[PDB]
Amino acid sequence: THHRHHQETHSFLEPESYIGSWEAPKDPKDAERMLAQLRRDYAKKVSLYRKDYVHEIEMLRVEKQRKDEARLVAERAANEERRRLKAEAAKVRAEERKIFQDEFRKTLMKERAEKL
């Protein structure tokens, strides 16, 4: 995600010795056997590379999963604390409300009796 990471974690590779390493055989029926052996050697390196890519993606996925697992419980703890604060705030508001409600109730009974 940065310049330094791609500077320091890039395999820069050496000159490959596989290029132009063919020799001319004396028999055409022999050369095609080495040609097919080169073709057989290519497929083994491909599946070795396939197994190497499978390891890295799974190792990325498990780290992403544990990161999400950490974030979830941090959010659950914070939300439990917020709920605990708000519940007692509602409780003290509900307890302070009743005295004004009761004092309002008495005068309505008083003013209805005087009209009666």
Binding site: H6, Q7, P15, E16, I19
Partner: protein, 53 residues
């Protein structure tokens, strides 16, 4: 021919403007950029402004 391989995607970002680059010479070896290649990288990037003059 030589090539200039660019690592596209959000994980291959060299920064705000493009992706990281390397060469990979025809013989199978790869090197970091020269000053000429670094100038090409600098001069082909997008710029975050309206066109002045």
């Amino acid at each position: 021919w030589k090539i200039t391989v660019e690592k596209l995607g959000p994980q291959g970002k060299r920064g705000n403007g493009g992706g990281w680059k390397f060469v990979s010479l025809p013989d199978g070896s790869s090197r970091p950029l020269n000053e000429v290649e670094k100038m090409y990288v600098k001069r082909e990037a997008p710029r975050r402004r309206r066109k002045i003059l």
